[PDB]
Write a protein that binds this ligand. Structure first.
Ligand SMILES: [K+]
Ligand SMILES: [K+]
Ligand SMILES: [K+]
Ligand SMILES: [K+]
Ligand SMILES: [K+]
Ligand SMILES: [K+]
Ligand SMILES: [K+]
Ligand SMILES: [K+]
Ligand SMILES: [K+]
Ligand SMILES: [K+]
Ligand SMILES: [K+]
Ligand SMILES: [K+]
Ligand SMILES: [K+]
Ligand SMILES: [K+]
Ligand SMILES: [K+]
Ligand SMILES: [K+]
Ligand SMILES: [K+]
Ligand SMILES: [K+]
Ligand SMILES: [K+]
Ligand SMILES: [K+]
Ligand SMILES: [K+]
Ligand SMILES: [K+]
Ligand SMILES: [K+]
Ligand SMILES: [K+]
Ligand SMILES: [K+]
Ligand SMILES: [K+]
Ligand SMILES: [K+]
Ligand SMILES: [K+]
Ligand SMILES: [K+]
Ligand SMILES: [K+]
Ligand SMILES: [K+]
Ligand SMILES: [K+]
Ligand SMILES: [K+]
Ligand SMILES: [K+]
Ligand SMILES: [K+]
Ligand SMILES: [K+]
Ligand SMILES: [K+]
Ligand SMILES: [Mg+2]
Ligand SMILES: [Mg+2]
Ligand SMILES: [Mg+2]
Ligand SMILES: [Mg+2]
Ligand SMILES: [Mg+2]
Ligand SMILES: [Mg+2]
Ligand SMILES: [Mg+2]
Ligand SMILES: [Mg+2]
Ligand SMILES: [Mg+2]
Ligand SMILES: [Mg+2]
Ligand SMILES: [Mg+2]
Ligand SMILES: [Mg+2]
Ligand SMILES: [Mg+2]
Ligand SMILES: [Mg+2]
Ligand SMILES: [Mg+2]
Ligand SMILES: [Mg+2]
Ligand SMILES: [Mg+2]
Ligand SMILES: [Mg+2]
Ligand SMILES: [Mg+2]
Ligand SMILES: [Mg+2]
Ligand SMILES: [Mg+2]
Ligand SMILES: [Mg+2]
Ligand SMILES: [Mg+2]
Ligand SMILES: [Mg+2]
Ligand SMILES: [Mg+2]
Ligand SMILES: [Mg+2]
Ligand SMILES: [Mg+2]
Ligand SMILES: [Mg+2]
Ligand SMILES: [Mg+2]
Ligand SMILES: [Mg+2]
Ligand SMILES: [Mg+2]
Ligand SMILES: [Mg+2]
Ligand SMILES: [Mg+2]
Ligand SMILES: [Mg+2]
Ligand SMILES: [Mg+2]
Ligand SMILES: [Mg+2]
Ligand SMILES: [Mg+2]
Ligand SMILES: [Mg+2]
Ligand SMILES: [Mg+2]
Ligand SMILES: [Mg+2]
Ligand SMILES: [Mg+2]
Ligand SMILES: [Mg+2]
Ligand SMILES: [Mg+2]
Ligand SMILES: [Mg+2]
Ligand SMILES: [Mg+2]
Ligand SMILES: [Mg+2]
Ligand SMILES: [Mg+2]
Ligand SMILES: [Mg+2]
Ligand SMILES: [Mg+2]
Ligand SMILES: [Mg+2]
Ligand SMILES: [Mg+2]
Ligand SMILES: [Mg+2]
Ligand SMILES: [Mg+2]
Ligand SMILES: [Mg+2]
Ligand SMILES: [Mg+2]
Ligand SMILES: [Mg+2]
Ligand SMILES: [Mg+2]
Ligand SMILES: [Mg+2]
Ligand SMILES: [Mg+2]
Ligand SMILES: [Mg+2]
Ligand SMILES: [Mg+2]
Ligand SMILES: [Mg+2]
Ligand SMILES: [Mg+2]
Ligand SMILES: [Mg+2]
Ligand SMILES: [Mg+2]
Ligand SMILES: [Mg+2]
Ligand SMILES: [Mg+2]
Ligand SMILES: [Mg+2]
Ligand SMILES: [Mg+2]
Ligand SMILES: [Mg+2]
Lengths: 51, 96, 78, 16, 64
RNA sequence: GUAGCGAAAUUCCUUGUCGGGUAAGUUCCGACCUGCACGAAUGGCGUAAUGAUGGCCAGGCUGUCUCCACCCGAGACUCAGUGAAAUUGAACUCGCUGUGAAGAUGCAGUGUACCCGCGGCAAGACGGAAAGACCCCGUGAACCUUUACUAUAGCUUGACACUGAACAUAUGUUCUAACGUUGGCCCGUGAUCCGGGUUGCGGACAGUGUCUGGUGGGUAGUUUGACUGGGGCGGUCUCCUCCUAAAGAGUAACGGAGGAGCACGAAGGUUGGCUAAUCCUGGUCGGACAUCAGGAGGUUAGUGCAAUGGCAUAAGCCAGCUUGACUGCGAGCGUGACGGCGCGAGCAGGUGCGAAAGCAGGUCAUAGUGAUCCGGUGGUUCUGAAUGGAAGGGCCAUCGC
RNA sequence: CUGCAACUGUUUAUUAAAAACACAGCACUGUGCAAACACGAAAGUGGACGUAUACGGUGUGACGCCUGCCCGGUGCCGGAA
RNA sequence: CGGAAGAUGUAACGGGGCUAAACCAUGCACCGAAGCUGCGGCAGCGACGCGCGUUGUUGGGUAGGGGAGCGUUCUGUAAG
RNA sequence: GGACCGAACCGACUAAUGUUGAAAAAUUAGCGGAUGACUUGUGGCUGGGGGUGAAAGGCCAAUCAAACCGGGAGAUAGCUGGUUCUCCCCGAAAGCUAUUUAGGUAGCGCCUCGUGAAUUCAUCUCCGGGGGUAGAGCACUGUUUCGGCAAAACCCGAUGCAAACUGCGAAUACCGGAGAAUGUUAUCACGGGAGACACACGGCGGGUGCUAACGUCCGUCGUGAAGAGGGAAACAACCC
RNA sequence: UUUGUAUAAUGGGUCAGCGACUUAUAUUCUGUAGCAAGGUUAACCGAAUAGGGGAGCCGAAGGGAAACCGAGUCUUAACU
RNA sequence: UCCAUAGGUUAAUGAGGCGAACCGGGGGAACUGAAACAUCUAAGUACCCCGAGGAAAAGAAAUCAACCGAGAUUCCCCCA
């Protein structure tokens, strides 16, 4: 039980977020993925934030 | 509700929703009820006098249920699309 | 003394659900299996857990094809 | 070993 | 005296047209990150109480 | 762990060993020390006297006994009078061997036995008596304990109130007028109560109220699991894989064996490519085994982690580009008592890889988990207790113990 | 001859009289008097018409010879920057 | 056939007894149940014709479900 | 003089008796104290989580780890017992799952009553299926015995063993389709009412145990349970 | 009461008398009667088992957490 | 203690005690239910105490309502 929960927040400023987990020791760099934002209905960049 | 000690059904399921106060003072009127008022003017007060809706009802909707033969003037009530057709077909008119 | 055993898992109800000649609707599970003891033939799909399911209405048909003598399940559109 | 206690008396009760 | 509603049951079940009951699914309050989206999406809509359970529900909600 | 004591009111082994006593002594007395597990005021060691106190020995004495006999009285027994009790399904109520809710008057087979009293005896009627006190069980009870849980009287701390004035630098000293007095004297008064008066002594202290931290078995209410070849002790309790399991599914035991309570932004997606172990032969350092070449071999390898089923079109290995580990849904189906859990073509939106057909809603598959309530965070074309707002509630997403 | 308790006492009315309780003696400790302490929402009362050679609590248990080491734990006492 | 000992009494064919009245084989007779058939009767369910007839079939039961009744006291019918 | 012996008086160490007693604690013979921390009369005070206790949880009106009387009160009792007239029809279960659950209870299964929809369901025949059991085998995973070749293993042979071995593999069973005949509609759905969730033995397939148990735990069928009659001397569960 | 009792498991000495599924209200289902897209009144008034009293209640519409829409509605940007 | 006050004496008037329920107020359980139990329940019940009357208590809006309005208290039926 080392992987901590994180939220990936939309860059579209919709407030929509996905959640996932992350090994913060091994991979300290912030996760950044293009994901579908259903509010704007577009693939936008999602960036890591605190759960 | 007791099931021998197993979490009962009404406890293992989540609560949901809230109760509207506005719903309590809202009523539905059938077309069949429009003929039961006195004068041929269906308003909130004539519906109450005719014992169609309760005394504390503030809002009422006429819905397409039953038939309306006579012409009636509906005043102040909401009316469904289907009910509007039926009332106007019977020679009535809907006043906002 | 005592025992160090005494454990097992729930039975998973695997196996053939629809046998040869049975008429199935599309979507119907034909076999539940760990790994592909049977392989998907015509009009049969393989799910992520290697469940074989009908992709069309028809009759289930088992058949052995190939040099390895692999068991295929297919749906004969009927 | 013994399977019974040695017999004892009961307390007095109004008899009838 | 009047039968009393089990008030907790009345907050969890609502009677439908043909006289069944709808309820919200369990398992969508928390610990959501680990659950598949498909699983969660299927828990969102209200479901109907099953045959085995109706008797229990009806007993709890005499004025439903 | 000293002095002292020690097989002891303490020594399990143990009737320890040695000595004394007896014909013979698991007890007794004296020692030894190997004190299972003595030991100094929950006192150590001694100790005259005392004891309806525990142990052992001897003299005397004896019907305690060898082994009983006889006798005197009171009953027993018979007659007259009076006249209970426990118990009791019904009885025409024998032995034996077998049978059988497994120890028979009552069943089977068989043996024996004319009907009925009276005195006696207690082997049986699982005799009478008391809904077993042992043992277990009940989400019974009581009382007791404590560093069980939760409270709480009491004790204690500070804040505010009753409670004031000077002075010096929140703290101290001084003051008197609140307040205290279980000091003295006077009066009510014939009164060691009480009140008033005068005076002294304390004095804003003490003390009391409200609030507050600590302490609190002093007291109270309670809790203190289940399974179990009785209970306890031990073990176990959810999930995954195999076997038991009787060639569909399912299938028990405190049956036989192992695992889980995760990992991974690549170990996911896609496109293109690729194919193992082991051994043999030769070769710098180089050896049984490193890397190189060829041959045999044919998956005996590999698969993030158990086991099983799978895997070459690889699900195994390598590289490029990526975020489908998408959002809304879902014909149909599997599996559960239910809560639930699982598989899923296809449809819409938007995406990645590929020339394209296509493939992609995580991972070869099956473990890696937890309902509800209460609460948190973000969003919201819902609600908003006269009205506009807002709080609060709902809905969607998500989190916590 | 010997265990235990010094002794006289006390005790389970109704299965235990004892080696148990008490005891004189010993020690520790609290208590300055409106005493500590106890009964009592309180007033009061006992302690005591007593005053540390007194009173309460606790342990030990005549007498003789004696009563060793440990203050880490728990309590109590004291300190306070 | 021996191997082969147990406690109240034969007591390890139920007994008497048996040399078959034992065992094996084959056969035919008979006995034997509340089974089956015969005769008479009752009831349930269903056909079939018009409540009745004809006919098939069914009728062991604990928990328990369903159906139909008896009788008791009291009220009306009953100042009968 | 809490001194000695010993009556009264106060106690209560031993034994016998008595034990539906003469007596709900005594009698008889012995026994301890007997100027004291003695004993006794009369009156008084202490009250129930309270008293009082030279301490035994003793005693507080024959009652004491919380008196007695009345009340809350018909406390609660998942436990035991008991539950009253008649006839007719059908007729279980002693399983699964969950449970501070295990002798309780709940959903489901099994019973009954009612309503509704199918030539629904069952038996047999034929047809289409998957199987990995019995058996067998030994390439595989392990195990085993002996040989022939060799730096004494492999290679080359012979021989066994396996619940957790399979290069093989039945009978049955199960799923589906078609067809006849027969059957109390026996199948399915919904609704009213349950009971039951201690099972027993016998056969067959097994785990466990000693291929011990009238043992224990599963599967499956039968009987008992809830079933009388005949047989097995007698004998729920065996035979008819 | 039990898997199972002649059981040596429980209970009853016998007789007579008494002794255990009730009552109220709510709710659901069945039967039956009335009326029927309607049905029915409560308290109360009334000398009135009449009559009045329709306050109410149930039903004739649902969907949605809700606003709201309505033979549809919810879900969704939108549904095959 | 100088006035005074406390105190004292006499007179007049009244009170006290009892009572089945009902009523207002001061105190106030536990068993029990929650299938244990502590919040909660039982229940402001039982019980104790004080007071009062033929009744008691309550009562004449610093009340509701919802932009329309109502018009003290008490009791009954609804709302539920
Ligand atoms: K010794
Ligand atoms: K010792
Ligand atoms: K001590
Ligand atoms: K001493
Ligand atoms: K003595
Ligand atoms: K006989
Ligand atoms: K005889
Ligand atoms: K006898
Ligand atoms: K003064
Ligand atoms: K002060
Ligand atoms: K305490
Ligand atoms: K067992
Ligand atoms: K046993
Ligand atoms: K990849
Ligand atoms: K890749
Ligand atoms: K002695
Ligand atoms: K001594
Ligand atoms: K004595
Ligand atoms: K004592
Ligand atoms: K210490
Ligand atoms: K210390
Ligand atoms: K006296
Ligand atoms: K008491
Ligand atoms: K008494
Ligand atoms: K059940
Ligand atoms: K039913
Ligand atoms: K082999
Ligand atoms: K069996
Ligand atoms: K039968
Ligand atoms: K029994
Ligand atoms: K008995
Ligand atoms: K009813
Ligand atoms: K009706
Ligand atoms: K629709
Ligand atoms: K309580
Ligand atoms: K309970
Ligand atoms: K309890
Ligand atoms: Mg109305
Ligand atoms: Mg398995
Ligand atoms: Mg949520
Ligand atoms: Mg010795
Ligand atoms: Mg010796
Ligand atoms: Mg001798
Ligand atoms: Mg000695
Ligand atoms: Mg000692
Ligand atoms: Mg010392
Ligand atoms: Mg000491
Ligand atoms: Mg001593
Ligand atoms: Mg006589
Ligand atoms: Mg016998
Ligand atoms: Mg005789
Ligand atoms: Mg005798
Ligand atoms: Mg007896
Ligand atoms: Mg008993
Ligand atoms: Mg306690
Ligand atoms: Mg309690
Ligand atoms: Mg247990
Ligand atoms: Mg199987
Ligand atoms: Mg099988
Ligand atoms: Mg089974
Ligand atoms: Mg992978
Ligand atoms: Mg507002
Ligand atoms: Mg407001
Ligand atoms: Mg000795
Ligand atoms: Mg003594
Ligand atoms: Mg003495
Ligand atoms: Mg005694
Ligand atoms: Mg005695
Ligand atoms: Mg002592
Ligand atoms: Mg003999
Ligand atoms: Mg016959
Ligand atoms: Mg017959
Ligand atoms: Mg006949
Ligand atoms: Mg019959
Ligand atoms: Mg019958
Ligand atoms: Mg003397
Ligand atoms: Mg005495
Ligand atoms: Mg005497
Ligand atoms: Mg004397
Ligand atoms: Mg004791
Ligand atoms: Mg007494
Ligand atoms: Mg008590
Ligand atoms: Mg009560
Ligand atoms: Mg009772
Ligand atoms: Mg029958
Ligand atoms: Mg639980
Ligand atoms: Mg075999
Ligand atoms: Mg059970
Ligand atoms: Mg059982
Ligand atoms: Mg069984
Ligand atoms: Mg067997
Ligand atoms: Mg058995
Ligand atoms: Mg056996
Ligand atoms: Mg039974
Ligand atoms: Mg029979
Ligand atoms: Mg028979
Ligand atoms: Mg017979
Ligand atoms: Mg038994
Ligand atoms: Mg019998
Ligand atoms: Mg008998
Ligand atoms: Mg009997
Ligand atoms: Mg009994
Ligand atoms: Mg009896
Ligand atoms: Mg609606
Ligand atoms: Mg409770
Ligand atoms: Mg009066
Ligand atoms: Mg008044």
């Amino acid at each position: 039980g080392i992987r901590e929960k994180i939220k990936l927040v939309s860059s579209a400023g919709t407030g929509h977020f996905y959640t996932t987990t992350k090994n913060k020791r091994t991979k300290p760099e912030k996760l950044e993925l293009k994901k579908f934002d259903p509010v704007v209905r577009q693939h936008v960049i999602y960036k890591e934030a605190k759960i | 509700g007791f099931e021998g000690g197993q979490m009962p059904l009404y406890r293992r399921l989540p609560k949901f929703g809230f109760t509207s106060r506005k719903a309590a003072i809202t009523a539905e009127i059938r077309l069949s009820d429009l003929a039961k008022v006195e004068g041929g003017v269906v308003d909130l007060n004539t519906l109450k006098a005719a014992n169609i809706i309760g005394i504390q009802i503030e809002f009422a909707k006429v819905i397409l249920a039953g038939e309306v033969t006579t012409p009636v003037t509906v005043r102040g009530l909401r009316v469904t699309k289907g009910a509007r057709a039926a009332i106007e077909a019977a020679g009535g008119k809907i006043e906002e | 003394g005592s025992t160090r055993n005494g454990r097992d898992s729930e039975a998973k109800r695997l196996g053939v659900k629809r046998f040869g000649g049975e008429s199935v609707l599309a979507g119907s599970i034909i076999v539940r299996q760990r790994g592909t003891k049977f392989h998907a033939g015509a009009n049969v799909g393989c799910g992520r857990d290697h469940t074989l399911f009908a992709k069309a209405d028809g009759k289930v048909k088992f058949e052995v094809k190939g040099p390895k003598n692999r068991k295929f399940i297919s749906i004969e559109a009927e | 070993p013994p399977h019974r206690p040695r017999p004892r008396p009961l307390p007095w009760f109004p008899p009838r | 005296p009047k039968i009393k509603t089990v008030r907790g049951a009345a907050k969890r079940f609502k009677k439908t047209g043909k006289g069944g009951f709808k309820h919200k699914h369990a398992n969508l309050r928390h610990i959501l990150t680990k659950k598949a989206t498909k699983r969660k999406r299927h828990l969102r809509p209200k479901a109907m109480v099953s045959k085995g359970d109706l008797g229990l529900v009806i007993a709890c909600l005499p004025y439903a």
